[PDB]
C-alpha cells in the first residue's frame, strides 16, 4: 500500500476517482523495478507462479501474489524494464517443450535451443 | 504514469507522497482550492466527537472500512471526485493520518503560493509571501517596536549567551 | 466464514475472510479447490484475514478466491479401517485403495489427556523381545526413542514389533511415515503387505498407516503427526486399545515443523529450532500416555539431529523419553537378529523400585556381566583371551550365550531368513539370562542360545545341537 | 600536509580497531548497517581511503611522506577478524608481537614469523642488512629444529651449535623496557653476535655484554661508529676495527 | 461500549493479542479474554494493548472481548495450597479445583530489604547425607540442584522431602517446611507418579505443588514460579520456613525465551534476552531468610536446573551460579556407575553453607569432606591406601540408594562409624548391610542416644562414647 | 511539566510530555505514582514524546497518567551522612536508619574531570597478597577491575580485600552494590555491622554503601553506578578523600544498559550489546580515577560473562584498567585461592623500574617459568613426562610449588576455608618465589606451598611432612 498507493501513478487520479487502466488482475504496471524484481502493481487473479510477459518482451513470473502487487521474478534484465510497465499476463504458468526428442538437443532451461542446433524436437510442451 | 506537481508544501513521503498526487490531480482541473476549502470544512466535521468513533471509528469491527465515507460524507457532496481518495483512506486505515494531509494540503493551500520563515528572535514571523526580507522588514513596519527581542527573545541567547560562550 | 485469497505468498495464504475469523486452526477449504486445499488458520492477522498455511501447494492460482472456512479444523476419518490403509494427512487414502471413512472424523484437535486422566503410575510393558524385556522392558503409554540402521532387519524389526504388540496386548499401531520417502514408503508398503502384517485381508491390519511424504508441504509433513496422534487417542481410548505410535522419523517431523516456524517469519528458536519447539513437541507429546481406557505407547523413530543431543530437539526429547532403543549395527554385524545396541537401549525407568527389584537386579546382573564382559572384550582384545581366568572365560561364555540368547529369529521373517522366530515371554527371559548367569548351562553349546526365544528353547537347541 | 610539504610524518593510529567500533556504532544508531562482525563494510574503504593518504610522495610533494603505522590491538590474536583481514589486505605486512615470549619475559615478545615486511630492504641500512640478513636466517633455522619435530630438543649436532647461535641472537633482538637506540649502535652489538664472539658466552649475559659493550663502543668507537654512521653500512674501517673490537673488547668484556 | 477497559482483539495470531481498547487500564493489569483466558496487559501501547495471553489461541476467534479484571495479577498465597497441586492461578489441577488460597498476593512483591532480612543459620535438611553434611546450609539459601534427566535428580528431592516429613509431621518449629515444588515442564504422568510418591510421603499437606507438566501454555508456566514465589514468601514472612524447589527454571527460561523472541524481543547469548537474568533475580532475590520480624522467615530456595551436559559454561547457568548460594552438581556418570546418589562433589559446593546447618554433623562432616577430598585426590603408600579403603567405604556411606533420607542424628552416627574406620573394618559390600543392622540396633537400643544426639546438635563426648561403645560391639561382632 | 503515560512497555516508559520536553536526562517523577517512580528521559522521540526509563515498578500506570518532570536530571543527596548507610540508588536509605539526609544533592550524570588535574601517573597499592602485589601491582586510585566468574570466591575475595584494606585505609570507602544480591549486601551488612567500621555511631562510617540490586529494574541498576560515582567524586574531590570504591558489579550495570538497549528500540549490539557500550564505559569510567583531588581507587567487580573475556564487554574493559584483575576459574577449580589468572591479571606498572625491577624480575623468572610450563601442557596432557627434558622436569615441580605458593587460605573466610588464611608482606613474597627460583625446595613436598602466606611457613608446611 504505502508508497504504492501514495504512488500516484495510481493515486494521482484515484483522488479524482479516475483510473481505468491495467486490469491489475491480468495486467500490471511495474511498481518498482530493480534487480529483476518487478513489483508489479496489480495482478491478483493472475495464475500464481505464472510466467508472464512484460512490456519489454521478457518473461517474468508472477510468483508472489501480494495484495497489491505481484513480486515478479524477471527472467532477465531490468534496465530495459521500467516502472509502470505493463505486464500482461500470458495467462500461463510454465510448460516447457517436452517430448523425448530432445535427445540430441542442448537447451536453455525453457526447453528451447541454446545449442545453436536450431530448435529442438519437442512438439509437445508440458507443464 | 502521472506528472509531478508541488505549489509550496510539500512534504515528500508518508502522506507527502500522497498529497503530491492530489496536488497534481486537484491542481490539474484546478479543483484544488475548491477542495482545500472543501477539505478544511471536513477537517473538523470529520475530527469530531458526535463521532469520537462514528466518522473516524476505524474498528470495533470492520464495516467502517467497507464504507462509512465511501457512505457518511459521500453522504456529503463534499469531496465528489476527491471523496474517492477519502474512501481509499477509509478502507486503507490511514483515516487518522488525514490531519497531516490537510495540514500538508492547507499549509500547502494558503502558503500554497506562499512563503513562511522565522529568523532569529522573532517567532510569529510566519506568513505567505512571494518575496522576502523586504516583507519581513514590513513586519518591522508593523512597528519595529514589539519585535526581534520578544516572542523569542535576544535576551539570554542570541546576544546574551554568545558572550558567555566565548568563556 | 468465507475468504478470498488476498495474498498467496507461497503456501502462506493470506486469506481474508470476509466474515468472522473463527478460532485459530480452523480448516478452511478454498473453493476453487479441486483438491482440498484446506487452509489451516495460522494467524488471525486481523482483517479476518488469516495467515494460513496451505495444505495444498500454490500452483497456478488466481486470487481473491472463494474460500469457505470449514469452520473447524482439518478432518480425517478415525477408527479401525485406517489399519491396513494409508492415508495422507487429510485422512484420505494414498493407499490409493479407496476410501477410509473410519466412522468418526476428526479435527486433529484431540488434545492432551488431562491430569485426572492419567494413570498416576504406568508400569512396565513388555515387547516379546528378550533383550528389551529384561533390560529395557517397555512402559504402557510411554515414548521410546529409536536409533539404529536402515533396514538392519530394522524395518522388519518394527514390523515384528507391530506384530507382537498388536497381538499381545490386543494393541494396534499407527505408523506415521513422517516425511516418508514416497518410493520407500511404496516399498514400505510392500514389505508390510509382504509380511502380511499388512493384511489386504483386513484393513484391520496391525497398523494404520499414515504416510506424509517429502513432496508434501512442510506443514503437511509436520501435521500428519498430529493427525496420527489424534488417531491413536481414538484407538486408545475409544478402541480401548493399546496403540503404538510409530513415528517415523520424528526428526523428519521436526524438520517439517521447523521449516514452518522459520518460514512463518516467526522466530523459531536458535539455530532455527522451533520457537515453540518444546511446546510443539509438548502439545503432541502430552497426548501420549495410558489414560485409563488405553495407552498409546510411542515408538519414536529418532534420527538424532546432527547426532547432537543437547541439540535442543533431543534435549527436549529426552524429557519425553523413558527408554531408548539404540539398535546396534554392531550387534546386527555380530549376525545377531535381534541387532540391538544393548546397553544403549535403555529404560532409566527400569529401576528395582519400579520393575521387580529382582527384575531389575537380574537385569542389572546381566548388565554387570555384560558390561564388565565388554571390559574383558578389551582384555581379550589386548592379547587374546588366553589372558583370562576361567570363570571369567565362563562368564564370557555366558555373556556370549546371553548374546546368542538375545538372538531370536524373526517370526514375521521366519519365512525370509528361514529363521523361524519366536516371541519371548518375560519370565522365561529374566530367568533365562539369570539361569545362564547361574552358569550350569555354561557347559551347554552356545548356538543353542542362538536364535531362540524363551530360554528352555535354548536348552532344546543345546541338546539337539549336541 | 606534511607529506606534501616534504615532511615525513608518522602517524600511529592506535587504533582503528576502536575506530571501527565507533564507526559502526554510529552507523547503527543511524541504522546504517552492521555488516560482518557487526561492522558495515566500507570501514575497510574508510581506512583505505584514509591510509592511501599515507604514502611516500615524490619531490613535487616535497618528497614527503606520511608514514602510517596503523595499530590494531588484537583480541586474542583475532586477525582473520574482519577488520584485521581487511587491514592485512591493505598492509604490506603486519608486525606480530608474541605474548608467550612476553611471559617468558621476552619483551619485545614478537613473532616475527608473523611479522612481515614484504618491503624488507627499502627500509634499511646496509649496515644492518649485512649483519642481519644472515641472522634472520640463523634464527629461522634455529626455530626450525625446535619445529620439524615440534621439540626444542635437537635433530643434528651441527645445529647443536647453530641453536646456540640462534639462542644468542635471541638474547640480542630483545629491547629494553623503555629503550630505543640508533642504527650503528644497533649494528654494533649485532655484528658482535652475527659474526659470533659471544656463543663463547652464555645467552643471558649477551645483553649484559651489551651494557658494557655498548658503553664501550659509545666511548671508544664512536669514532668507528663515526664511520659506520657515516657509511650507513659497515665499512672496511669499521669492520676491521670491529673484528678486532669485538674480539678484543669481548675478550675484555669477559676477561 | 468500553474499549477502555475491555478491548476487541485487534490481532492475534502470534497468540498475542493486540487488542484495541482497554485504555483506562492501569499498567500491569491481569485481563481476561472471552475464552476465560487471562492475559496480562504487557504493553500499553498508545493504541492497543499487547497482551500476553494466558491461554492458547485456537481458543480464540478475533475481535474477542477482552475485559479488564481490573486487577494487577495476583496469585493465591496462604496455606490452602498445602495439599494441592495447582495450576499457577491456583486452581488445583489435581482436579481438586478450588481448595486453593483465599488470599492472593500481588505477584509483584519484591525482595525485602537487607535489614528486613537476617541471615540463615536455620538448619535445613534433606536427610540426604551429602547435603546435610557436605553442603550444609541455612534456609533462605538459593542453592542450585543441578544434574541431568531425573537421573535420580528428581529422586533427590523425594528423599529430601521425605526427611522433612517427620519434621513437618513433627512440630519442628523450624522444620515445618513448606514445600513448594514447582514442577516445571514435567509430563503429567510423571508428575502423577511423583505426586503419588509424595502422597505416599504425604508431605503434601504442608506442601504446595505448583504444577507445570509438559504441555502447558508457557506464560502460565512462566508465571507459575512467581506465583509460587509469592506463596513461599508467604510462609517465610509469616515466620515459617519454606522450601521451594524450582524444578526447573531451565524450562521456564525456554518458555520465556520462546516467548521473548515471539514477543520479537531480543536474545543475546543463547538466544535469550538478558532479563532472563532479571527473571531469576527478580524471582530469586525475592527468596530469603528473613529477620526476626518476619519470624526470621524463610523460604529456602532450591532451584533446580536439571543440567544438559554440564554446560554451565552456559550463561544462564553462570547467571544462576552467581545468584545462587552454591550448586549441587549431580553426576550422571556416577549414577551410571550406579553411584546412588551420584553427585559431582567437586562441583557440589556450598561456599555458603557455613554455620547454618548442623554443628554435630560438622564434627564428622567437615572432616569427611576433607577426607573425601583427599581420597579423591589420589585419583601406593599406605597413608593413601587407608583413605582409599576408607574412602571406598565412604563412597558407600554417602551412597544412599534412592528412597531413603534420615534425621541427622543417624546420619552423624553412620558417618561416625566410617570415620572411626569402623566401616574400614568392613570393605564396601558389607557396609550397607551393616548399616541396616546397626541401624536397627542403635534404633532400638541406643534410641536413647540417637534421640539424644538429635538433641545435642553438636556431638558430645558422651554421645561419642556411648555411640562408640554401641558401635564397637555392634561393629566388632558383626563385621558384615 | 507533565507527561502522559503514553506507552508502558515495562519500565521503558514512553512518555509524552506535551508540556515541552525537558532535557534528555531530565529526571521525571510520576504523578499518580505516590511511590516515587523516577523516569529518566532517554530520547526526545519527537511527538513530545520521550522515551524515558522507569527504573522501577509499573503498577497502575494508566496510559495517559500524569508524570511530572523533576526539572533536572536525577539528583541525589550527597553528604557524609551516607557512610555507614546503605543507600540505594535513589539516595534513600536501605540502611533503614531513616533517610540518608544530606546537605547537597547532586545531579548524578556528570562530566569526566579534565586531563590536567588528573594526576597522569600513580603508585602501586599493596593489597597484602603476594600474588597480587607481585604479579599485578595495582595502583592506588586506579581502576582495578575484577574479572572473575560467578561467585568464584571473587565475592569472597573482595570481602577479604575489604578486610585487608578498608580497615587500614586513611580515606574512606564506598561500596556500590551494582546488581548485588540483597543477601550479599546483607552479609556484608552484618560483616560491616560486625566490623563496626560500619559503626553506627557514624553515619560517617568508614564505608558508605550504595546498593542497586538485582531485583531492581535495570534502569536502577544502570543508574546506581552514576549515583555512586557522584557521591564518591564528592568525597574524593570534595571531601578530599582517598576513596576506595568498591563496585560489585559493573557488569551488572552493563547488562542493565544492554538489557534496555533493545527496548530502547536500539539495535542492541553484538550478542545484544549496546553500540554505545564503549561510550558508556567512557562515561562512567572516565569519571572515576585519581586526580590531584584525591584518589578513587576503583574496584570494579566485573562479571566476565560466561568467563568470556574475548567477549567484547570485557574486551573493552581491559583498556580501562590500571589494573586488570583476572580471576582464573581454571585455577580456582584447582581449589586454589589465590585463584587468579595472573598471566592475565596485569598492572601496566607491572613494568620493571616502577615497582622495583628486582621485585618484578623475580617475578619475571617466575612468570616465565610458569608460562613455559604452561606451554608444555598440551604435550604433557597426553605425554606426561618421560621423553621430555629435565630442566623442565625441575621447572615443573618448581612451578608446581610456585603454583601452590601463590595459594593462601582465607583469613576472613575461615568459615569458608576452615583454615586460617594468611597474609604476606613483600619480602617473603619476593624472596618466596625467588627462593623457589633458587630451588631450595626440590626435595621438599611440592604441594606444601599450598594455601600459605609466607614462604617460611610454607617451608614449614613442607617440613612437618619432610
CB contact under 8 A, D105 and F367: yes
Tell me: do F125 and F223 sit in the same domain: yes
CA distance F42 to C28: 48
Query: In chain E, how many domains are there?
Result: 3
- CATH fold of A23-92 reads Elongation Factor Tu (Ef-tu); domain 3 (2.40.30)
**Are the CB atoms for E175 and E164 separated by under 8 Å?**
yes
- CATH number of the domain that E33 lies in? 2.40.30.20
**Are the CB atoms for C8 and C67 separated by under 8 Å?**
no
Residue D124 labeled ligand binder: no
Rounded to a whole number, what is the distance in Å from the CA of E40 to chain B's nearest CA?
21
Searching chain A, which residue's CA lies closest to the CA of residue B31? A16
**Are the CB atoms for E238 and F238 separated by under 8 Å?**
no
Residue F252 labeled ligand binder: no
Q: Is F234 left (phi over 0), alpha (psi -120 to 50) or beta?
A: alpha
Rounded to a whole number, what is the distance in Å from the CA of A71 to chain C's nearest CA?
9
CB contact under 8 A, C58 and A48: yes
Q: What cell does F403 get?
A: 603454583
Q: What cell does C140 get?
A: 504402557
CA distance C451 to F285: 76
Q: What angle in degrees, to the nearest 10, is found between the helix axes of E447-456 and E461-476?
A: 140
Q: What cell does F244 get?
A: 576506595
CA distance F295 to F121: 12
CB contact under 8 A, F266 and D103: no
**Resolution reading in Å:** 6.7
**Are the CB atoms for C139 and C124 separated by under 8 Å?**
yes
Instruction: Choose the closest CB to F368 out of D24, D76, D105.
Output: D105
CB contact under 8 A, C23 and E60: yes
CB contact under 8 A, C60 and A48: yes
CB-CB neighbors (< 8 A) of B61 in chain E: 8, 63
Three-class DSSP labels, chain C: CEEEEEEEECCEEEEEECCCCCCCCCEEEEECCCCCCEEEEEEEEECCEEEEEECCCCCCCCCCCEEEEEEECCEEEECHHHECCEECCCCCECCCCCCCCCEEEEECCCCCCCHHHCCCCCCECCCCCHHHHHHCCCECCCEEEEECCCCCCHHHHHHHHHHHHHHHCCCEEEEEEECCCHHHHHHHHHHHHHHCCCCCCCCCCCEEEEEECCCCCHHHHHHHHHHHHHHHHHHHHHCCCEEEEEEECHHHHHHHHHHHHHHCCCCCCHHHCCCCHHHHHHHHHCCCCECCCCEEEEEEECCCHHHCCCCHHHHHHHHHCCEEEEECHHHHHCCCCCCEEEEEEEECCCCCCCCCHHHHHHHHHHHHHHHHHHHHHHHHHHHCCCCCCHHHHHHHHHHHHHHHHHCCCEHHHCCCCCCECCCCCHHHHHHHHHHHHCCHHHCCCCCCCCCCCCHHHHHHHHHHHC
Q: What does the DSSP assignment read for D157-196?
A: HHHHHHHHHHHHHHHHH---TT----HHHHHHHHHHHHT-
CA distance F344 to D76: 12
Q: Which residue has 540396633 as its cell numbers? A: E441
C208 CA to centre of own chain: 12
State the alpha helices, DSSP H only, in chain B.
Answer: 16-27, 32-47, 83-91, 98-109, 135-139, 162-166
CA distance A62 to A85: 14
Q: What are phi and psi of C113, to 5 degrees?
A: -90, 135
Q: What cell does E62 get?
A: 478475533
Over the range A71-99, which residues count as b (16 or more CB within 10 Å of their CB) and which as e?
A: bbbbeeebeebebbbbbbbbeebbeebee
Mutate to test the interface with C, among E189, E210, E270, E315 (most CBs of C within 10 A): E189
B-E CB pairs within 8 A amount to: 9
CA distance F466 to E373: 22
CA distance E221 to E184: 7
B156 reaches A (C-beta below 8 A): no
Over the range D68-104, which residues count as b (16 or more CB within 10 Å of their CB) and which as e?
A: bebebeebeeebebbbbebbeeebeebebbbbebbbb
Searching chain D, which residue's CA lies closest to the CA of residue F363? D105
**Known catalytic residue at C181:** yes
CA distance F188 to F186: 5
CA-to-CA dists, residue D54 to B130, D49, D91, E76, E351, angstroms: 52, 9, 11, 72, 58
CA distance F449 to F451: 6
Tell me: do F289 and F375 sit in the same domain: no
Beta bridge partners of C38: C29
B112 CA to centre of own chain: 10
Element (H, E) at F437: helix F426-437
Contacts of E381 (CB under 8 A, 6+ apart): none
- C338 cis-preceded (ω within 30 degrees of 0): yes
* 3-class secondary-structure state, position F427: helix
DSSP letter assigned to residue F327: B
Catalytic residue among E149, E265, E269, E351: E351
Searching chain E, which residue's CA lies closest to the CA of residue B60? E8
State the alpha helices, DSSP H only, in F264-328.
Answer: 277-285, 312-317
- CATH number of the domain that C28 lies in? 2.40.10.170
The domain boundary residue, chosen from E36, E71, E106 = E71
CA distance F146 to F143: 10
Tell me: do E352 and E368 sit in the same domain: no
Q: Is the dihedral angle over the CA atoms F226, F232, F236, F237 positive or is it negative?
A: positive
Q: Is the dihedral angle over the CA atoms D51, D52, D55, D60 positive or is it negative?
A: negative
- Chains within contact range of chain F (3+ C-beta pairs < 8 Å): D, E
Tell me: do E328 and E218 sit in the same domain: yes
- CATH no. for D125-255: 1.20.150.20
- Window 5-34 of A, Cβ < 8 Å to C: none
Q: Which residue has 486399545 as its cell numbers? A: C241
Searching chain B, which residue's CA lies closest to the CA of residue A84? B1
Q: Please report how many Cα atoms fall inside a 13 Å half-sphere around the Cα of residue E278, on the Cβ side.
A: 24
Rounded to a whole number, what is the distance in Å from the CA of E339 to chain F's nearest CA?
23
Query: In chain F, how many domains are there?
Result: 3
CA distance E128 to E398: 8
* 3-class secondary-structure state, position A3: coil
CA distance E85 to E209: 5
Tell me: do F115 and F231 sit in the same domain: yes
Strand E6-12 to E65-72 pairing: antiparallel
CA distance F308 to B77: 70
**Are the CB atoms for C261 and C206 separated by under 8 Å?**
no
CA distance F39 to F70: 9
CA distance C319 to F438: 59
- Ranges assigned E (strand) in D60-214: 65-70
CB contact under 8 A, F214 and E277: yes
Catalytic residue among C40, C180, C239, C457: C180
Element (H, E) at F258: helix F250-261
Tell me: do F221 and F114 sit in the same domain: yes
Tell me: do C260 and C160 sit in the same domain: yes
F440 reaches D (C-beta below 8 A): no
Binding residues of C for ATP: 151, 153-156, 181
The domain boundary residue, chosen from C73, C95, C117 = C73
**Are the CB atoms for F100 and F85 separated by under 8 Å?**
yes
Mutate to test the interface with A, among B23, B83, B85, B104 (most CBs of A within 10 A): B85
Catalytic residue among D118, D143, D165, D168: D118
Searching chain E, which residue's CA lies closest to the CA of residue C343? E336
**Are the CB atoms for A99 and A91 separated by under 8 Å?**
no
CA distance E260 to E280: 15
CB contact under 8 A, E62 and C21: yes
Q: What angle in degrees, to the nearest 10, is found between the helix axes of C250-263 and C218-233?
A: 130
Amino acid at each position: 500500500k504505502t508508497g504504492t498507493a501514495e504512488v500516484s501513478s495510481i493515486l494521482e487520479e484515484r483522488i479524482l476517482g479516475a483510473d481505468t487502466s491495467v486490469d491489475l488482475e491480468e495486467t500490471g504496471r511495474v511498481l518498482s523495478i530493480g534487480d529483476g524484481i518487478a513489483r508489479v502493481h496489480g495482478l491478483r487473479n493472475v495464475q500464481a507462479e505464472e510466467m508472464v510477459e512484460f512490456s519489454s518482451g521478457l518473461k517474468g513470473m508472477s510468483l508472489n501474489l501480494e495484495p497489491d502487487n505481484v513480486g515478479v521474478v524477471v527472467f532477465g534484465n531490468d534496465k530495459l524494464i521500467k516502472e509502470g510497465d505493463i505486464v500482461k499476463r500470458t495467462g500461463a504458468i510454465v510448460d516447457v517443450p517436452v517430448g523425448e526428442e530432445l535427445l540430441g538437443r542442448v537447451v536453455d532451461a525453457l526447453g528451447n535451443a541454446i545449442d545453436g542446433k536450431g530448435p529442438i524436437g519437442s512438439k509437445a510442451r508440458r507443464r | 504514469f502521472a506528472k509531478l506537481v508541488r505549489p509550496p508544501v510539500q512534504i515528500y513521503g508518508i502522506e507527502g507522497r500522497y498529497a503530491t498526487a492530489l496536488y497534481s490531480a486537484a491542481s490539474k482541473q484546478n479543483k484544488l482550492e475548491q477542495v482545500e476549502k472543501e477539505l478544511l470544512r471536513v477537517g473538523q466535521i470529520l475530527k469530531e466527537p458526535k463521532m469520537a468513533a462514528s466518522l473516524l471509528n476505524p474498528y470495533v469491527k470492520r464495516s467502517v472500512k467497507v464504507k462509512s465515507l465511501s457512505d457518511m460524507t459521500a453522504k456529503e457532496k463534499f469531496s465528489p471526485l476527491t471523496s474517492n481518495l477519502i474512501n481509499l483512506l477509509a478502507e486503507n486505515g490511514r483515516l487518522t493520518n488525514t490531519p497531516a494531509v490537510i495540514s500538508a494540503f492547507s499549509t500547502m493551500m494558503s502558503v500554497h503560493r506562499g512563503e513562511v520563515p522565522c529568523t532569529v528572535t522573532t517567532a510569529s514571523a510566519l506568513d505567505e509571501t512571494t518575496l522576502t526580507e523586504l516583507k519581513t522588514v514590513l513586519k518591522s513596519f508593523l512597528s519595529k517596536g514589539q519585535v526581534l527581542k520578544l516572542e523569542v527573545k535576544i535576551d539570554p541567547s542570541i546576544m546574551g549567551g554568545m558572550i558567555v560562550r566565548i568563556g | 466464514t468465507t475468504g478470498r485469497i488476498v495474498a498467496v505468498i507461497g503456501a502462506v495464504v493470506d486469506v481474508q475472510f470476509d466474515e468472522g475469523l473463527p478460532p485459530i486452526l480452523n480448516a478452511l477449504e478454498v473453493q476453487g479447490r479441486e483438491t482440498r486445499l484446506v487452509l489451516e488458520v495460522a494467524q488471525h492477522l486481523g482483517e479476518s484475514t488469516v495467515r494460513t498455511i496451505a495444505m495444498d501447494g500454490t500452483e497456478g492460482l488466481v486470487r481473491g478466491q472463494k474460500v469457505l472456512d470449514s469452520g473447524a479444523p482439518i478432518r480425517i476419518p478415525v477408527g479401525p479401517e485406517t489399519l491396513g490403509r494409508i492415508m495422507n494427512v487429510i485422512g484420505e487414502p494414498i493407499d490409493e485403495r479407496g476410501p477410509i471413512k473410519t466412522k468418526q472424523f476428526a479435527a486433529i484437535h484431540a488434545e492432551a489427556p488431562e491430569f485426572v486422566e492419567m494413570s498416576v503410575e504406568q508400569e512396565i510393558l513388555v515387547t516379546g523381545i528378550k533383550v528389551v524385556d529384561l533390560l529395557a522392558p517397555y512402559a504402557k503409554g510411554g515414548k521410546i526413542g529409536l536409533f539404529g540402521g536402515a533396514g538392519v532387519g530394522k524395518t522388519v524389526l518394527i514390523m515384528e514389533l507391530i506384530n507382537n504388540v498388536a497381538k499381545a496386548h490386543g494393541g494396534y499401531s499407527v505408523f506415521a511415515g513422517v516425511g516418508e520417502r514416497t518410493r520407500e514408503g511404496n516399498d514400505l508398503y510392500h514389505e508390510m503387505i509382504e509380511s502380511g502384517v499388512i493384511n489386504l485381508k483386513d484393513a484391520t491390519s496391525k497398523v494404520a498407516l499414515v504416510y506424509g511424504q517429502m513432496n508434501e508441504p512442510p506443514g503437511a509433513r509436520a501435521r500428519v503427526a498430529l493427525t496420527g496422534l489424534t488417531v491413536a487417542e481414538y484407538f486408545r481410548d475409544q478402541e480401548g486399545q493399546d496403540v503404538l505410535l510409530f513415528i517415523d522419523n520424528i526428526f523428519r517431523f521436526t524438520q517439517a515443523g521447523s521449516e514452518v516456524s522459520a518460514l512463518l517469519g516467526r522466530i523459531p528458536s536458535a539455530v532455527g529450532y522451533q520457537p515453540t519447539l518444546a511446546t510443539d513437541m509438548g502439545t503432541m507429546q502430552e497426548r501420549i500416555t495410558t489414560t485409563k481406557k488405553g495407552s498409546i505407547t510411542s515408538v519414536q523413530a529418532i534420527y538424532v539431529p546432527a547426532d547432537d543431543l543437547t541439540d535442543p530437539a533431543p534435549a527436549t526429547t529426552f524429557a519425553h523419553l523413558d527408554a531408548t532403543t539404540v539398535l546396534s549395527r554392531a550387534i546386527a554385524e555380530l549376525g545377531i537378529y535381534p541387532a540391538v545396541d544393548p546397553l544403549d537401549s535403555t529404560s532409566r525407568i527400569m529401576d528395582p523400585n519400579i520393575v521387580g527389584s529382582e527384575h531389575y537386579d537380574v537385569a542389572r546382573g546381566v548388565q554387570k556381566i555384560l558390561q564388565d564382559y565388554k571390559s574383558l572384550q578389551d582384555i581379550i582384545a589386548i592379547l587374546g583371551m588366553d589372558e583370562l581366568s576361567e570363570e571369567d572365560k565362563l562368564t564370557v561364555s555366558r555373556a556370549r550365550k546371553i548374546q546368542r540368547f538375545l538372538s531370536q529369529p524373526f517370526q514375521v521373517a521366519e519365512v525370509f531368513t528361514g529363521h523361524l522366530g519366536k516371541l519371548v515371554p518375560l519370565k522365561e527371559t529374566i530367568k533365562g539370562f539369570q539361569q545362564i548367569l547361574a552358569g550350569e548351562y555354561d557347559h551347554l553349546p552356545e548356538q543353542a542360545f542362538y536364535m531362540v526365544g524363551p530360554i528352555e528353547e535354548a536348552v532344546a537347541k543345546a541338546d539337539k545341537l549336541a | 600536509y606534511f607529506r606534501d610539504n616534504g615532511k615525513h610524518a608518522l602517524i600511529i593510529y592506535d587504533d582503528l580497531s576502536k575506530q571501527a567500533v565507533a564507526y559502526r556504532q554510529m552507523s547503527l544508531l543511524l541504522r546504517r548497517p552492521p555488516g560482518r562482525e557487526a561492522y558495515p563494510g566500507d570501514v575497510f574503504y574508510l581506512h583505505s581511503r584514509l591510509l592511501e593518504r599515507a604514502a611516500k610522495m615524490n619531490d613535487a610533494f616535497g618528497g614527503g611522506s606520511l608514514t602510517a603505522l596503523p595499530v590494531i590491538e588484537t583480541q586474542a590474536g583475532d586477525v582473520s577478524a574482519y577488520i584485521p583481514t581487511n587491514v592485512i589486505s591493505i598492509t604490506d605486512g603486519q608486525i606480530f608481537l608474541e605474548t608467550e615470549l612476553f611471559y617468558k619475559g621476552i619483551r619485545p615478545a614478537i613473532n616475527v614469523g608473523l611479522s612481515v615486511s614484504r618491503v624488507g630492504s627499502a627500509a634499511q641500512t646496509r649496515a644492518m642488512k649485512q649483519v642481519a640478513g644472515t641472522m634472520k636466517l640463523e634464527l629461522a633455522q634455529y626455530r626450525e629444529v625446535a619445529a620439524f619435530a615440534q621439540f626444542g630438543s635437537d635433530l643434528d649436532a651441527a645445529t647443536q651449535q647453530l641453536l646456540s647461535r640462534g639462542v644468542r641472537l635471541t638474547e640480542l633482538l630483545k629491547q629494553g623496557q623503555y629503550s630505543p637506540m640508533a642504527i650503528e649502535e644497533q649494528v654494533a652489538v649485532i655484528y658482535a653476535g652475527v659474526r659470533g664472539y659471544l656463543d663463547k658466552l652464555e645467552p643471558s649475559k649477551i645483553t649484559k655484554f651489551e651494557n658494557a659493550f655498548l658503553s664501550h663502543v659509545i666511548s671508544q668507537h664512536q669514532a668507528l661508529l663515526g664511520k659506520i654512521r657515516t657509511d650507513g653500512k659497515i665499512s672496511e674501517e669499521s669492520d676491521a676495527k670491529l673484528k678486532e673490537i669485538v674480539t678484543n673488547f669481548l675478550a675484555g668484556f669477559e676477561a | 461500549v468500553d474499549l477502555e477497559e475491555t478491548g476487541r482483539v485487534l490481532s492475534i495470531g502470534d497468540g498475542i493479542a493486540r487488542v484495541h481498547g482497554l485504555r483506562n487500564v492501569q499498567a500491569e493489569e491481569m485481563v481476561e479474554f472471552s475464552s476465560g483466558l487471562k492475559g496480562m496487559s504487557l504493553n500499553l501501547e498508545p493504541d492497543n494493548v499487547g497482551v500476553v495471553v494466558f491461554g492458547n489461541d485456537k481458543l480464540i476467534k478475533e475481535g474477542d472481548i477482552v475485559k479488564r479484571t481490573g486487577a494487577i495479577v495476583d496469585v493465591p498465597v496462604g496455606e490452602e495450597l498445602l495439599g494441592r497441586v495447582v495450576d499457577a492461578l491456583g486452581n488445583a489441577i489435581d482436579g481438586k479445583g478450588p481448595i486453593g488460597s483465599k488470599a492472593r498476593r500481588r505477584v509483584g512483591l519484591k525482595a525485602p530489604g537487607i535489614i528486613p532480612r537476617i541471615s540463615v543459620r536455620e538448619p535445613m535438611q534433606t536427610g540426604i547425607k551429602a547435603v546435610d553434611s557436605l553442603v550444609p546450609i541455612g534456609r533462605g539459601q538459593r542453592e542450585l540442584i543441578i544434574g541431568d534427566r531425573q537421573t535420580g535428580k528428581t529422586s533427590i528431592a523425594i528423599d529430601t522431602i521425605i526427611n522433612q516429613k517427620r519434621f513437618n509431621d513433627g512440630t519442628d518449629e523450624k522444620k515445618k517446611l513448606y514445600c513448594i515444588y514447582v514442577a516445571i515442564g514435567q509430563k503429567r504422568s510423571t508428575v502423577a507418579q511423583l505426586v503419588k510418591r509424595l502422597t505416599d510421603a504425604d508431605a503434601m499437606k504442608y506442601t504446595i505443588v505448583v504444577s507445570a507438566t509438559a504441555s502447558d501454555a508457557a506464560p502460565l508456566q512462566y508465571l507459575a514460579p512467581y506465583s509460587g514465589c509469592s506463596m513461599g514468601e508467604y510462609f517465610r514472612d509469616n515466620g515459617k520456613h519454606a522450601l521451594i524447589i524450582y524444578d526447573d527454571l531451565s524450562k521456564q527460561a525456554v518458555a520465556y525465551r520462546q516467548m521473548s523472541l515471539l514477543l520479537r524481543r531480543p536474545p543475546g547469548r543463547e538466544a535469550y534476552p538478558g532479563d532472563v537474568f532479571y527473571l531469576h533475580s527478580r524471582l530469586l532475590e525475592r527468596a530469603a531468610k528473613m529477620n526476626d520480624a518476619f519470624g526470621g522467615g524463610s523460604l529456602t530456595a532450591l532451584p533446580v536446573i536439571e543440567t544438559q551436559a554440564g554446560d554451565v559454561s552456559a550463561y544462564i547457568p553462570t547467571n544462576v551460579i552467581s545468584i545462587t548460594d552454591g550448586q549441587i552438581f549431580l553426576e550422571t556418570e556416577l549414577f551410571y556407575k550406579g553411584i546412588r546418589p551420584a553427585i559431582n562433589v567437586g562441583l557440589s559446593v556450598s561456599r555458603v553453607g557455613s554455620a547454618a546447618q548442623t554443628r554435630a554433623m560438622k564434627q564428622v562432616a567437615g572432616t569427611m569432606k576433607l577426607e573425601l577430598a583427599q581420597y579423591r585426590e589420589v585419583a601406593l603408600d599406605a597413608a593413601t591406601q587407608q583413605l582409599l579403603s576408607r574412602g571406598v567405604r565412604l563412597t558407600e556411606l554417602l551412597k544412599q540408594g534412592q528412597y531413603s533420607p534420615m534425621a541427622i542424628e543417624e546420619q552423624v552416627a553412620v558417618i561416625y562409624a566410617g570415620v572411626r574406620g569402623y566401616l574400614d573394618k568392613l570393605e564396601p559390600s558389607k557396609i550397607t548391610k551393616f548399616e541396616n543392622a546397626f541401624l536397627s540396633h542403635v534404633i532400638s537400643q541406643h534410641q536413647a542416644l540417637l534421640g539424644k544426639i538429635r538433641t545435642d546438635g553438636k556431638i558430645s563426648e558422651e554421645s561419642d562414647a556411648k555411640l562408640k561403645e554401641i558401635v564397637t560391639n555392634f561393629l566388632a561382632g558383626f563385621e558384615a
